[PDB]
Amino acid sequence: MSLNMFWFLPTHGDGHYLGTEEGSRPVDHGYLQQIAQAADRLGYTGVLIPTGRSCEDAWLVAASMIPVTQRLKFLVALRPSVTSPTVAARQAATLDRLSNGRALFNLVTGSDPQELAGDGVFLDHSERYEASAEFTQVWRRLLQRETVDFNGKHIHVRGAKLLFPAIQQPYPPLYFGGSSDVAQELAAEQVDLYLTWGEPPELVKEKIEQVRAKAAAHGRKIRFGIRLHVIVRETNDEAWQAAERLISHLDDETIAKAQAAFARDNLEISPNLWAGVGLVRGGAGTALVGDGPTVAARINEYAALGIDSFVLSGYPHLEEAYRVGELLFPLLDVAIPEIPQPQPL
Amino acid sequence: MSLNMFWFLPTHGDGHYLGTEEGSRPVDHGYLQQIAQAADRLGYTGVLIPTGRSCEDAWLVAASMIPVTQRLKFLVALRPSVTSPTVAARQAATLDRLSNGRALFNLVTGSDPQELAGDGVFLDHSERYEASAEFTQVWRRLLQRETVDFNGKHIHVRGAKLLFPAIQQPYPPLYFGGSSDVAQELAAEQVDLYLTWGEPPELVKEKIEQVRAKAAAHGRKIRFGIRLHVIVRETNDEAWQAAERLISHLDDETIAKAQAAFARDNLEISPNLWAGVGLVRGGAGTALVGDGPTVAARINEYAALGIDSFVLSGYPHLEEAYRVGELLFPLLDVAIPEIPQPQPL
Amino acid sequence: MSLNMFWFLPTHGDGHYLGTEEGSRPVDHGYLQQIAQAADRLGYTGVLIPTGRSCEDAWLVAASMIPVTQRLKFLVALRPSVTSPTVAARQAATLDRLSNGRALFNLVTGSDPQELAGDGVFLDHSERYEASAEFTQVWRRLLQRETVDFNGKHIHVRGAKLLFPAIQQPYPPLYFGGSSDVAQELAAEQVDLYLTWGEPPELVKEKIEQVRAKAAAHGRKIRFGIRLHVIVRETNDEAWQAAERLISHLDDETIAKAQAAFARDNLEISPNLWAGVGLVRGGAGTALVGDGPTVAARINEYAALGIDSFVLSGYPHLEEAYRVGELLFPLLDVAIPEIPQPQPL
Amino acid sequence: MSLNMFWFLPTHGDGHYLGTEEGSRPVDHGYLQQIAQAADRLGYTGVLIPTGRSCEDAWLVAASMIPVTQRLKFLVALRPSVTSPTVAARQAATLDRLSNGRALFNLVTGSDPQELAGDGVFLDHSERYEASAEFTQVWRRLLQRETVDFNGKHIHVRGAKLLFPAIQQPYPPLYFGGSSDVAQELAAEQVDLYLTWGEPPELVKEKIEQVRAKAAAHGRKIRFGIRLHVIVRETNDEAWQAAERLISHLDDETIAKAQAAFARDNLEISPNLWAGVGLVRGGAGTALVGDGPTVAARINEYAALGIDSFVLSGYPHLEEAYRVGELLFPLLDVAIPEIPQPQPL
């Protein structure tokens, strides 16, 4: 069990400070390329490329990194009702073929009705998950070379088929997350890896056992991954110091309110698990803060729960990819990806 | 009036012979890259990247060519009902930003109900054009930074907006074609360049004057482009010889039937305008066959009709991009693209 | 015994015709890149990059192709007296490290006193080979991590050492050729592969047995390679036709004189071994002309002599790399290179 | 007078700490590429690529960065007696042509007899400068398309000529430095820019006026550049703190000895000019330490002396290129390079 270390492409903006354009860094192809090549050479298994109206399209970003990376994988978001499962399967096959089998998919059920309404989607909190199950069903079948005639509540295709096969078999891996029971069931029945948030190890445990169980109910077993922000430094004080530094430009009310929300600094919801990174939405909710060993221990503790993937992030993303790769990778049993050999002609 | 010369990326397959896997050439990223960099260095304005279930997704292909080209533009297809105009506007903005303003869009109203039904689209020959007009309306507004509330027969978005602006102003150029009166009207009212097929100069003339007129009816004037396959050689015999060579593996019945279809070789529907390339669908319908001067004359004759863009192609596409660029470009007034300077940081 | 197929980078110019600027093609980085990536993807083991005042520096050309190729090797020329063996060893180590072990070296003893005098070298036909042996001696030792104190007739270094080791062990392969007895002895004692010209199989045989023998005299066995130009077509007539076409712009006197030089068309010194490509210096002396099978047979016949490498070429070099890779590779047992995995960090 | 900002490629090693392999970072093509593309996108005019047995060859490194950068220039070292001026002119022309005019040359007269003896050079402290003048003379003439017959004390070529011209006119810029009167005279008579070390502004002044004067004595005027290491932070304390941090792993004796060497911390030889970076050889001798304004002021003060180029560096080099580009560039009048347009075909 070697850990698959993932990084993140900040397609909605990057910088040294949370909640401010101060110290921010413009994100263009050039900068995105720097991060991707950094992850590619440092041994990261892949990078998560976010979705949302607030990000540049993840699929195109991923594709524009193909000729400039050789072994890094791209975990791009799949958005159900927003697009036709047939078209998404076709794009999936193309991303996989052009990158020579380095595509990964992460289904994301929309949760912002206003965003969804902007795309032409109008489904209640339930229908959104119903359409997601139907979409995922069709998608997966298409990637398995099947011709699909499907007429469900939300999805309706007739004689849908992909004329080009993907490289990876049966099909490119599919990740999905969510704590709602409905989300856990969708994963437990169709995805390959259930991606959970970074909660204290005990709560993480509970959730895995729940999905592991739901998974079993279908005669299936899935993998697990955790999303964590990382602020690793040489010592624990520099680490915590870097944490305070990160949110130093946040609104005084925000900071004040957070302390009130955490009534039992108040941000450390567990030893070296700081919720200060979640005071602004757009990234991870928690962050492992500490020195190499402490961070590597918290990580190993999660791995011991059955988690083989760790989608990490840091500010700024170019510099911190190096920080983590140099202070953390050496203390862990990191799985090192290989450059796929050219497909025969 | 310098002519904008375009090439084609054969995303559905390439080779030395029509209608056979004999002499064919596998099309992967590597090969697609060869062609794109060849067009980029030879001075082509851009390359058309086809759409259809038979092609690999044009958008991802285009994106994967960004870091490997510097001035070449990508004319990718826009497919209405198949996708949400909001999502397509968002991808359009991202392709334009990542490539630094080198994105071009070519609207394609689907015509194969079976393909469409495979994607989840079920619209008659009319509704297809109605949904196209509504889609194009919304798309264009989105790229102009507008928030769009739209409820038409087919399109329905509420509060749709792009958070990232495209580079090109007002928005990335939009091409569209079609001889049906309904298609000509759509172009005449929303697109920037009307792309016509390569018909004898007289019929091409007529069509341009029709759209030019329809365009005027809206207090608008549009540009014109023509799609032509090219078989230029040092002499006219090598040219015609290369033409015969191209379709030498076609089915005997096909060849026989074509001659019967052309009752007034029979393929030369006009001096040096050979319809032999249209005996198999997937590419251009006609081809300018002849030596440099003859081809350059036929081309100039079309330019004299008001056509400033020429989307060309040849088999194989890598070698023929060089053929055309070396035997033809020197005899024409080719517009040479520039490498956009980096956007300020 | 899989055959290692090599191509050639035309760093002194390329085109469709010999002895004329007519049909020529400007050679810049872009074009050189096209050829290198074409060889890289088509399965060629590597490319020979020529030396001489008439070529752009092979080492820099090779280096500028590193980020744009992944498995292709670069066989660059090593020029003795022109440069310090210490500096050449240091550059050798750097080319090998930056390309991740894809450097190959081909020693070339200068033969043009005027070129040599232009570089500051003034050695008779003998001293040139004496300095070559001394240079090669030092070079090889340096690449084996040795500190070298050497004082010979021509070479004199004291405490020379490379602080960086090459990737390949013992050191990057070293090729050398030449029919003179002195050259055969140098190879037979220091190089890894003796590169011979394409002479009729019988004369090729004789030469190999001579060097194989000289090699044995040192308790060494070396490999063998042959330099051949290739004009392979679908049929033998197109092949011979392409051959005539190639030299159609040569001076009438040249052609006339060649026929006189071959007294026993006159160019075919052996079945399908045409000396027409040697009527202008700068490339290979002979060319295998014929269809796939005939060419593949002539090639296999050479392989049967103990030749495992074939440095090929064709005009133009981009198009013909494809010609050979598609019409010839399928008929042979071609060794397919691998993408080296990243060195550990 | 916009300032040309240069960075440095650490081809002999990079890291977070001076004088230790602790916190060091392996330097390969991948990492070198990261830095070069970072400088290229951040607006740096170019990067200095060091020379010496302790570095990987600068010319090959520079060349391997051509396809991965678009406007950045490469200032590579020229080493006189080590190589033939004819060969160096030929490589110079090739680097300039392949990169499309982005080559810069920095003559370096060797000073380590043991290094020189390792390369085959045995010249006293004088002859080294005599051979440098002769080498530079020939080099420059060769790049101006001249055929050179030269017979001096050390250099001897007959009928030396470059068959390929460089892109830049008259020839690629030539930098040179040195405080010895002999070095100042060589610059004052042949180079385009005299590169001086970062000494207190008053001593820098004096030196410029000396060379400016020597330059005038030849009816010539040259440009000036300064080599400075930079540790810019948000505040002056973080800056000085980062400085102390940098040399925290240095040998206790070294630190102790330095304090003794500076008898009048002791390292601050002038306000915000820290000599702590010179306690280990291999990089710059001094460093501007301070916040944005303080650093930008020290820099402007140097510019006011007639210095238009600033070759900067920082540890680590990838992260600090960003540090300087983000905290410093905004406070200065930085000259922004352009992407050269493709040469006509």
Side-chain angles (χ1 to χ4, degrees), chain A residues 1-263 265-345, chain B residues 1-263 265-345, chain C residues 1-263 265-345, chain D residues 1-263 265-345:
Chain A
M1 178 182 61
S2 272
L3 314 182
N4 304 309
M5 308 304 284
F6 286 72
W7 200 234
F8 187 79
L9 284 196
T11 54
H12 38 24
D14 194 16
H16 296 79
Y17 302 110
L18 286 177
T20 179
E21 206 271 306
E22 160 92 2
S24 71
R25 179 177 292 166
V27 169
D28 53 15
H29 183 70
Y31 184 60
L32 286 174
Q33 177 168 319
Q34 290 262 89
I35 304 180
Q37 292 190 304
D40 189 57
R41 66 180 297 275
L42 291 177
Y44 286 90
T45 296
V47 288
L48 167 46
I49 309 172
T51 185
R53 321 178 78 178
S54 46
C55 306
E56 246 159 315
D57 193 76
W59 296 64
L60 302 183
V61 170
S64 69
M65 300 301 210
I66 286 183
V68 286
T69 57
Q70 297 174 290
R71 51 177 180 159
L72 184 82
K73 286 192 182 189
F74 315 109
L75 174 56
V76 310
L78 234 182
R79 301 293 265 83
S81 294
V82 154
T83 192
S84 168
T86 306
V87 179
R90 188 161 58 237
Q91 297 183 306
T94 292
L95 182 70
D96 199 49
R97 293 157 64 78
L98 295 179
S99 69
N100 193 34
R102 294 184 289 138
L104 292 171
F105 297 99
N106 171 38
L107 179 85
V108 172
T109 296
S111 72
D112 185 12
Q114 297 181 310
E115 171 183 306
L116 299 172
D119 284 316
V121 178
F122 308 94
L123 307 175
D124 62 56
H125 64 115
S126 293
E127 302 181 296
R128 280 202 295 282
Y129 280 86
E130 292 165 57
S132 279
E134 274 169 41
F135 178 95
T136 303
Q137 198 68 195
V138 173
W139 187 78
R140 292 164 64 213
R141 291 220 238 136
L142 288 183
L143 283 163
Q144 296 179 332
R145 303 279 259 158
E146 290 181 43
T147 287
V148 186
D149 281 336
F150 191 95
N151 201 317
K153 309 188 186 66
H154 320 83
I155 303 296
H156 181 205
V157 296
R158 184 199 296 134
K161 74 187 63 180
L162 292 190
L163 285 58
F164 303 87
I167 303 307
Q168 286 173 281
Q169 243 74 66
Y171 52 80
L174 183 46
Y175 300 19
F176 181 47
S179 285
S180 68
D181 206 65
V182 67
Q184 300 195 313
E185 174 56 36
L186 209 181
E189 178 184 306
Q190 301 193 59
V191 314
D192 304 310
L193 187 154
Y194 173 80
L195 226 185
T196 200
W197 346 300
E199 283 187 283
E202 46 270 60
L203 293 171
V204 167
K205 181 226 300 175
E206 195 187 317
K207 207 152 298 184
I208 289 178
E209 301 192 66
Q210 298 182 185
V211 168
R212 211 194 286 291
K214 292 162 173 293
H218 295 76
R220 304 184 63 243
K221 66 171 186 179
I222 59 175
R223 292 203 282 127
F224 295 94
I226 192 165
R227 174 75 175 93
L228 290 163
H229 187 269
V230 186
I231 302 187
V232 70
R233 288 295 180 285
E234 274 171 43
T235 78
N236 270 70
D237 286 333
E238 285 179 47
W240 287 109
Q241 179 183 60
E244 309 298 299
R245 184 68 175 285
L246 172 65
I247 58 176
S248 53
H249 290 56
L250 278 190
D251 192 57
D252 295 81
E253 281 302 296
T254 304
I255 307 304
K257 179 182 174 185
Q259 292 307 302
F262 294 86
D265 175 62
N266 268 166
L267 301 172
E268 193 175 8
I269 66 180
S270 168
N272 299 287
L273 227 211
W274 185 70
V277 71
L279 302 190
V280 179
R281 194 183 152 191
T286 57
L288 290 175
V289 187
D291 58 28
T294 303
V295 173
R298 295 294 172 285
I299 275 192
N300 285 316
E301 168 175 47
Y302 279 125
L305 296 182
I307 301 167
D308 69 58
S309 299
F310 298 74
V311 185
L312 315 175
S313 56
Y315 292 100
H317 288 64
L318 174 56
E319 290 96 324
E320 291 300 275
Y322 272 84
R323 188 85 69 178
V324 170
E326 305 187 319
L327 297 199
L328 197 52
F329 279 28
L331 305 184
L332 296 176
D333 180 353
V334 174
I336 35 188
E338 311 245 80
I339 292 168
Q341 281 301 311
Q343 292 290 314
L345 268 58
Chain B
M1 178 182 61
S2 272
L3 314 182
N4 304 309
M5 308 304 284
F6 286 72
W7 200 234
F8 187 79
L9 284 196
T11 54
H12 38 24
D14 194 16
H16 296 79
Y17 302 110
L18 286 177
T20 179
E21 206 271 306
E22 160 92 2
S24 71
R25 179 177 292 166
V27 169
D28 53 15
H29 183 70
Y31 184 60
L32 286 174
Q33 177 168 319
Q34 290 262 89
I35 304 180
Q37 292 190 304
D40 189 57
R41 66 180 297 275
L42 291 177
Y44 286 90
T45 296
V47 288
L48 167 46
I49 309 172
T51 185
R53 321 178 78 178
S54 46
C55 306
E56 246 159 315
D57 193 76
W59 296 64
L60 302 183
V61 170
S64 69
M65 300 301 210
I66 286 183
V68 286
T69 57
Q70 297 174 290
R71 51 177 180 159
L72 184 82
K73 286 192 182 189
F74 315 109
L75 174 56
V76 310
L78 234 182
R79 301 293 265 83
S81 294
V82 154
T83 192
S84 168
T86 306
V87 179
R90 188 161 58 237
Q91 297 183 306
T94 292
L95 182 70
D96 199 49
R97 293 157 64 78
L98 295 179
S99 69
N100 193 34
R102 294 184 289 138
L104 292 171
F105 297 99
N106 171 38
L107 179 85
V108 172
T109 296
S111 72
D112 185 12
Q114 297 181 310
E115 171 183 306
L116 299 172
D119 284 316
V121 178
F122 308 94
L123 307 175
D124 62 56
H125 64 115
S126 293
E127 302 181 296
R128 280 202 295 282
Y129 280 86
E130 292 165 57
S132 279
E134 274 169 41
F135 178 95
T136 303
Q137 198 68 195
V138 173
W139 187 78
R140 292 164 64 213
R141 291 220 238 136
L142 288 183
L143 283 163
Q144 296 179 332
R145 303 279 259 158
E146 290 181 43
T147 287
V148 186
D149 281 336
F150 191 95
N151 201 317
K153 309 188 186 66
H154 320 83
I155 303 296
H156 181 205
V157 296
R158 184 199 296 134
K161 74 187 63 180
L162 292 190
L163 285 58
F164 303 87
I167 303 307
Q168 286 173 281
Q169 243 74 66
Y171 52 80
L174 183 46
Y175 300 19
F176 181 47
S179 285
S180 68
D181 206 65
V182 67
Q184 300 195 313
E185 174 56 36
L186 209 181
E189 178 184 306
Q190 301 193 59
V191 314
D192 304 310
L193 187 154
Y194 173 80
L195 226 185
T196 200
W197 346 300
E199 283 187 283
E202 46 270 60
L203 293 171
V204 167
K205 181 226 300 175
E206 195 187 317
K207 207 152 298 184
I208 289 178
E209 301 192 66
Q210 298 182 185
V211 168
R212 211 194 286 291
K214 292 162 173 293
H218 295 76
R220 304 184 63 243
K221 66 171 186 179
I222 59 175
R223 292 203 282 127
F224 295 94
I226 192 165
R227 174 75 175 93
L228 290 163
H229 187 269
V230 186
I231 302 187
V232 70
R233 288 295 180 285
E234 274 171 43
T235 78
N236 270 70
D237 286 333
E238 285 179 47
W240 287 109
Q241 179 183 60
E244 309 298 299
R245 184 68 175 285
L246 172 65
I247 58 176
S248 53
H249 290 56
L250 278 190
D251 192 57
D252 295 81
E253 281 302 296
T254 304
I255 307 304
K257 179 182 174 185
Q259 292 307 302
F262 294 86
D265 175 62
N266 268 166
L267 301 172
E268 193 175 8
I269 66 180
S270 168
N272 299 287
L273 227 211
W274 185 70
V277 71
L279 302 190
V280 179
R281 194 183 152 191
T286 57
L288 290 175
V289 187
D291 58 28
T294 303
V295 173
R298 295 294 172 285
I299 275 192
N300 285 316
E301 168 175 47
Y302 279 125
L305 296 182
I307 301 167
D308 69 58
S309 299
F310 298 74
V311 185
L312 315 175
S313 56
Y315 292 100
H317 288 64
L318 174 56
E319 290 96 324
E320 291 300 275
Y322 272 84
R323 188 85 69 178
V324 170
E326 305 187 319
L327 297 199
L328 197 52
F329 279 28
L331 305 184
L332 296 176
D333 180 353
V334 174
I336 35 188
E338 311 245 80
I339 292 168
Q341 281 301 311
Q343 292 290 314
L345 268 58
Chain C
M1 178 182 61
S2 272
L3 314 182
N4 304 309
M5 308 304 284
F6 286 72
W7 200 234
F8 187 79
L9 284 196
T11 54
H12 38 24
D14 194 16
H16 296 79
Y17 302 110
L18 286 177
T20 179
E21 206 271 306
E22 160 92 2
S24 71
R25 179 177 292 166
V27 169
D28 53 15
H29 183 70
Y31 184 60
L32 286 174
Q33 177 168 319
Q34 290 262 89
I35 304 180
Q37 292 190 304
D40 189 57
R41 66 180 297 275
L42 291 177
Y44 286 90
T45 296
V47 288
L48 167 46
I49 309 172
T51 185
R53 321 178 78 178
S54 46
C55 306
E56 246 159 315
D57 193 76
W59 296 64
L60 302 183
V61 170
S64 69
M65 300 301 210
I66 286 183
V68 286
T69 57
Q70 297 174 290
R71 51 177 180 159
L72 184 82
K73 286 192 182 189
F74 315 109
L75 174 56
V76 310
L78 234 182
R79 301 293 265 83
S81 294
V82 154
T83 192
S84 168
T86 306
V87 179
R90 188 161 58 237
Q91 297 183 306
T94 292
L95 182 70
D96 199 49
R97 293 157 64 78
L98 295 179
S99 69
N100 193 34
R102 294 184 289 138
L104 292 171
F105 297 99
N106 171 38
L107 179 85
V108 172
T109 296
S111 72
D112 185 12
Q114 297 181 310
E115 171 183 306
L116 299 172
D119 284 316
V121 178
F122 308 94
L123 307 175
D124 62 56
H125 64 115
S126 293
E127 302 181 296
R128 280 202 295 282
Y129 280 86
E130 292 165 57
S132 279
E134 274 169 41
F135 178 95
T136 303
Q137 198 68 195
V138 173
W139 187 78
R140 292 164 64 213
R141 291 220 238 136
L142 288 183
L143 283 163
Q144 296 178 332
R145 303 279 259 158
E146 290 181 43
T147 287
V148 186
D149 281 336
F150 191 95
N151 201 317
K153 309 188 186 66
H154 320 83
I155 303 296
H156 181 205
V157 296
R158 184 199 296 134
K161 74 187 63 180
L162 292 190
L163 285 58
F164 303 87
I167 303 307
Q168 286 173 281
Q169 243 74 66
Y171 52 80
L174 183 46
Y175 300 19
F176 181 47
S179 285
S180 68
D181 206 65
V182 67
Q184 300 195 313
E185 174 56 36
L186 209 181
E189 178 184 306
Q190 301 193 59
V191 314
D192 304 310
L193 187 154
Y194 173 80
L195 226 185
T196 200
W197 346 300
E199 283 187 283
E202 46 270 60
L203 293 171
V204 167
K205 181 226 300 175
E206 195 187 317
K207 207 152 298 184
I208 289 178
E209 301 192 66
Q210 298 182 185
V211 168
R212 211 194 286 291
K214 292 162 173 293
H218 295 76
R220 304 184 63 243
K221 66 171 186 179
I222 59 175
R223 292 203 282 127
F224 295 94
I226 192 165
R227 174 75 175 93
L228 290 163
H229 187 269
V230 186
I231 302 187
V232 70
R233 288 295 180 285
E234 274 171 43
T235 78
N236 270 70
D237 286 333
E238 285 179 47
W240 287 109
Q241 179 183 60
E244 309 298 299
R245 184 68 175 285
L246 172 65
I247 58 176
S248 53
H249 290 56
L250 278 190
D251 192 57
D252 295 81
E253 281 302 296
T254 304
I255 307 304
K257 179 182 174 185
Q259 292 307 302
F262 294 86
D265 175 62
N266 268 166
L267 301 172
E268 193 175 8
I269 66 180
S270 168
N272 299 287
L273 227 211
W274 185 70
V277 71
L279 302 190
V280 179
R281 194 183 152 191
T286 57
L288 290 175
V289 187
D291 58 28
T294 303
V295 173
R298 295 294 172 285
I299 275 192
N300 285 316
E301 168 175 47
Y302 279 125
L305 296 182
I307 301 167
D308 69 58
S309 299
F310 298 74
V311 185
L312 315 176
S313 56
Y315 292 100
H317 288 64
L318 174 56
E319 290 96 324
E320 291 300 275
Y322 272 84
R323 188 85 69 178
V324 170
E326 305 187 319
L327 297 199
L328 197 52
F329 279 28
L331 305 184
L332 296 176
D333 180 353
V334 174
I336 35 188
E338 311 245 80
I339 292 168
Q341 281 301 311
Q343 292 290 314
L345 268 58
Chain D
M1 178 182 61
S2 272
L3 314 182
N4 304 309
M5 308 304 284
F6 286 72
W7 200 234
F8 187 79
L9 284 196
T11 54
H12 38 24
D14 194 16
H16 296 79
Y17 302 110
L18 286 177
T20 179
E21 206 271 306
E22 160 92 2
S24 71
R25 179 177 292 166
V27 169
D28 53 15
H29 183 70
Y31 184 60
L32 286 174
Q33 177 168 319
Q34 290 262 89
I35 304 180
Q37 292 190 304
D40 189 57
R41 66 180 297 275
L42 291 177
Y44 286 90
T45 296
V47 288
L48 167 46
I49 309 172
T51 185
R53 321 178 78 178
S54 46
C55 306
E56 246 159 315
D57 193 76
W59 296 64
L60 302 183
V61 170
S64 69
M65 300 301 210
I66 286 183
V68 286
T69 57
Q70 297 174 290
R71 51 177 180 159
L72 184 82
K73 286 192 182 189
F74 315 109
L75 174 56
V76 310
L78 234 182
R79 301 293 265 83
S81 294
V82 154
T83 192
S84 168
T86 306
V87 179
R90 188 161 58 237
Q91 297 183 306
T94 292
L95 182 70
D96 199 49
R97 293 157 64 78
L98 295 179
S99 69
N100 193 34
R102 294 184 289 138
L104 292 171
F105 297 99
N106 171 38
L107 179 85
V108 172
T109 296
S111 72
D112 185 12
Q114 297 181 310
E115 171 183 306
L116 299 172
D119 284 316
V121 178
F122 308 94
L123 307 175
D124 62 56
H125 64 115
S126 293
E127 302 181 296
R128 280 202 295 282
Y129 280 86
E130 292 165 57
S132 279
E134 274 169 41
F135 178 95
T136 303
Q137 198 68 195
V138 173
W139 187 78
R140 292 164 64 213
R141 291 220 238 136
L142 288 183
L143 283 163
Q144 296 178 332
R145 303 279 259 158
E146 290 181 43
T147 287
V148 186
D149 281 336
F150 191 95
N151 201 317
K153 309 188 186 66
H154 320 83
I155 303 296
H156 181 205
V157 296
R158 184 199 296 134
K161 74 187 63 180
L162 292 190
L163 285 58
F164 303 87
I167 303 307
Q168 286 173 281
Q169 243 74 66
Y171 52 80
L174 183 46
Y175 300 19
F176 181 47
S179 285
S180 68
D181 206 65
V182 67
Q184 300 195 313
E185 174 56 36
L186 209 181
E189 178 184 306
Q190 301 193 59
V191 314
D192 304 310
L193 187 154
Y194 173 80
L195 226 185
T196 200
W197 346 300
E199 283 187 283
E202 46 270 60
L203 293 171
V204 167
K205 181 226 300 175
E206 195 187 317
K207 207 152 298 184
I208 289 178
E209 301 192 66
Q210 298 182 185
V211 168
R212 211 194 286 291
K214 292 162 173 293
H218 295 76
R220 304 184 63 243
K221 66 171 186 179
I222 59 175
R223 292 203 282 127
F224 295 94
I226 192 165
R227 174 75 175 93
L228 290 163
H229 187 269
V230 186
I231 302 187
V232 70
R233 288 295 180 285
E234 274 171 43
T235 78
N236 270 70
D237 286 333
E238 285 179 47
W240 287 109
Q241 179 183 60
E244 309 298 299
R245 184 68 175 285
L246 172 65
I247 58 176
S248 53
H249 290 56
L250 278 190
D251 192 57
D252 295 81
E253 281 302 296
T254 304
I255 307 304
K257 179 182 174 185
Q259 292 307 302
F262 294 86
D265 175 62
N266 268 166
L267 301 172
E268 193 175 8
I269 66 180
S270 168
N272 299 287
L273 227 211
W274 185 70
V277 71
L279 302 190
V280 179
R281 194 183 152 191
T286 57
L288 290 175
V289 187
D291 58 28
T294 303
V295 173
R298 295 294 172 285
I299 275 192
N300 285 316
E301 168 175 47
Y302 279 125
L305 296 182
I307 301 167
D308 69 58
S309 299
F310 298 74
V311 185
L312 315 175
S313 56
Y315 292 100
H317 288 64
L318 174 56
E319 290 96 324
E320 291 300 275
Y322 272 84
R323 188 85 69 178
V324 170
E326 305 187 319
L327 297 199
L328 197 52
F329 279 28
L331 305 184
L332 296 176
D333 180 353
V334 174
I336 35 188
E338 311 245 80
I339 292 168
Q341 281 301 311
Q343 292 290 314
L345 268 58

